Amino acid sequence: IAPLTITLVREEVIDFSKPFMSLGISIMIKKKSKPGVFSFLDPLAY
Amino acid sequence: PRSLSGRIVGGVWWFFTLIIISSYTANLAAFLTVERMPIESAEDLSKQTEIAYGTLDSGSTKEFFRRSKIAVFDKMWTYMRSAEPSVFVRTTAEGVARVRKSKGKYAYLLESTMNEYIEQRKPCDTMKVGGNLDSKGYGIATPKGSSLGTPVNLAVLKLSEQGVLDKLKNKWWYDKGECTSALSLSNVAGVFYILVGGLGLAMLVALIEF
Amino acid sequence: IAPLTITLVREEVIDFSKPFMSLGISIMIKSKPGVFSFLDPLAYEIWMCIVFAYIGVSVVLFLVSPRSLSGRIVGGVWWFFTLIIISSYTANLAAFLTVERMPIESAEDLSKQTEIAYGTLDSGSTKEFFRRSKIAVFDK
Amino acid sequence: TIVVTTILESPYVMYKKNHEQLEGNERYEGYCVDLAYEIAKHVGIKYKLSIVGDGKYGARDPETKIWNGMVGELVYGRADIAVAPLTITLVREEVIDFSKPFMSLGISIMIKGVFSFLDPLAYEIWMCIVFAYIGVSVVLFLVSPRSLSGRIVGGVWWFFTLIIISSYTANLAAFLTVERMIESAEDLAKQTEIAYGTLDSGSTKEFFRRSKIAVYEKMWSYMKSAEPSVFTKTTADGVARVRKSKGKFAFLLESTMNEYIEQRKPCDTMKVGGNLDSKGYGVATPKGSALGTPVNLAVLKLSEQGILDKLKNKWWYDKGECKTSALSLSNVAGVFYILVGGLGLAMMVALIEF
Amino acid sequence: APLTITLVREEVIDFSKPFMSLGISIMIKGVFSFLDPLAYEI
């Protein structure tokens, strides 16, 4: 009982229940909020 | 009226401020255009090389890209396999640490479940972007011919239908967590305070006049 | 006496003078007025409605005749209306100019995409150059 | 010869162009026709495609408990195998055997907008700019040429609106420049102006009813109480409702169908967000079939070789029907209606004054 | 060495074919970024 993906190669040697959780390849980036009134003083230089 | 002297002054000063406000507008458009240019999908990744990106050094995610016949994914593979220094990591924890310690120059391709879990962990400096690239599933395993197999599968269908698996994921990902499109109010707010400040200054100049 | 490249394989069998002309692999890609690049930003349908509402306001004001609250808010709303339009025209005109600058100017530009296909002679030194290259852009 | 039961359902199995002059398996084309040929090749058998008579997938009749559809054909000895978009479900796995999934899918959101004008400048910003608007008309109201007091007020207010209109213009330029493609279940859950629902019975409704995930529980609470009903009788009804309800309905359905409709004319719908859950279509064999093992291994082989991905791409995208250099009237139109509305309001205020 | 193939030298020594090509080129280190947007003609 673990986060073990159901794959063909594994299924050929063990039995797997139907999936208890879905997943897929996704993207992780270093950062979704950024105020700072200093984004207004930037466009037109001090 | 038509005091030619100070007349051209008002005209030239107008042309002067016209250029400036035009510059401010144009430049401000660029800060938002580039802000979108800064990764939101595989396609974004596939298109550049300022931000390096890789996957676990061995495993199904690396293979997915190696074998893929989809144009975006094949472009990402030819880049990755030749990238130097190596964009592949020995462990998943390394790929997460690499994202966190690369100062915005590294993106990691990992399983959605893990990505969304780290997003809810302090220091709250990572983010999951784009839709899933493929679909897989976790399953409970037993030796072949096991007497436990039938019952255990039925149990998973049941727990899913009772909505229990969803409760469990929310409990461990979100309840125990530690952390859309367009513009923000932040920047615009700064201009609101300077306005009220001007109004107050006037309300002060008014009182003294009377 | 011809545009014959000095190559090792040929030099091993014939004699070559010093080069009378230099060359290298380069990129070949395929004036444009048309006042119709001005009617595009703001759609013909939009130019029409902005004119219909134009006379649609000059007729509403015509029924009115300082702070005449009635026609006052008309001038204000009409101003806010034209403000949005001219802002839209400006913004839209910028994307067409931003992308116009964004459409190939180098090997690197080519290497980065797949909207514009690109190839070389099917046999020869240019094909080989890319086949053998160890430079990242050229290998891509 | 293996009797293969299947179902006429695009793009899985469709009548070929000129089928009336063709015979047997050659009458049909589609994703599952191609899949049947691959499975047969790998397992080494000859086969006959037979369209299920009642046009049904397979459910137990409420009264008799007899199975209909393709499941019926298998359990009552009429077909040897079902190759079709037949969902792997508990009720079916109790009576037939399924291969591992040959296609994964999940619940997904289908949507068909003056809301592209309210986005650039945030609703919160439109509000404050109005509060400060009356906040200045009240300050000036307390004042009553070069009245220095209210003078700097007009100047500062002008500089204020200058920045805002500049921001609006700049920001509006961004979406129309990059233009990267309701955007999530989370979005849907937080609002009620855009209604959303499912088929009135079946697995999609049941997913929401049973879910313990906060967002889907919130969605279920809304959907089950919404009036008029957000539930529909058929996929066609749901899709029509999306198309004709002026952007006020989103439909929740299987991703495969959502994706297929997105690639057909009139090209006016799209899938938004990822899949909300995961299920699979499988090949089904009757209990005790000597084909069970070989069929399962064939499916896993085709998957791992990338054949099934390619096949999906073929029938959804290669056969599909759906830079940028154009500006629309839609957004600008919303500003025209608010104008005429203002003119009408004035024409009303005028009459009362006289 | 970076020894240019020249007539005066080829008269007295033999040169290989070039190992590096080169040519005369312009080196530079601007209010002219304001006159560009709107053309001088405009």
State how far residue B147 is from chain A, nearest Cα, in angstroms. 11
Burial class (CB in 10 A: 0-12, 13-18, 19+), E33: exposed
Contact D301 A8 (CB under 8 A): yes
3-state secondary structure (DSSP) of residue A30: strand
Whole-angstrom distance, CA of residue B187 vs CA of residue A40: 6
In the block, residue with structure tokens 């007349």: B7
Whole-angstrom distance, CA of residue D316 vs CA of residue B58: 31
Give the alpha-carbon dihedral of C9, C15, C20, C25, to 10 degrees: 0
Q: What is the resolution of this structure in A?
A: 8.2
Whole-angstrom distance, CA of residue A42 vs CA of residue D352: 51
Q: Tell me: is residue E18 an annotated ligand-binding position.
A: no
Handedness of CA D1, D3, D4, D9 (dihedral sign): positive
Residue ranges of alpha helices (H) inside D17-113 are: 31-43, 69-75, 90-93
3-state secondary structure (DSSP) of residue A25: strand
State how far residue E12 is from chain C, nearest Cα, in angstroms. 15
Whole-angstrom distance, CA of residue B72 vs CA of residue B55: 15
Across the A/D interface, how many CB contacts are shorter than 8 Å?
Answer: 19
- Which technique was the structure solved with, according to the deposited record? cryo-EM
Whole-angstrom distance, CA of residue D152 vs CA of residue D158: 9
Annotate D264-296 with b (16+ C-beta within 10 A) or e (fewer): beeeebbbbbbbbbbbbbbbbbbeebebbebbb
- Residue D67's φ and ψ, nearest 5 degrees, are -75, 135
Chains A and C: 3 or more CB pairs within 8 Å of each other: no
Could you say which of B28, B153, B165 has the minimum Cβ distance to residue D167?
Answer: B28
Chains E and A: 3 or more CB pairs within 8 Å of each other: no
Question: Which amino acid is residue C19, in one-letter code?
Answer: P
State how far residue C57 is from chain E, nearest Cα, in angstroms. 34
Q: Which residues have a Cβ under 8 Å from the Cβ of D23 and sit 6 or more positions away?
A: none
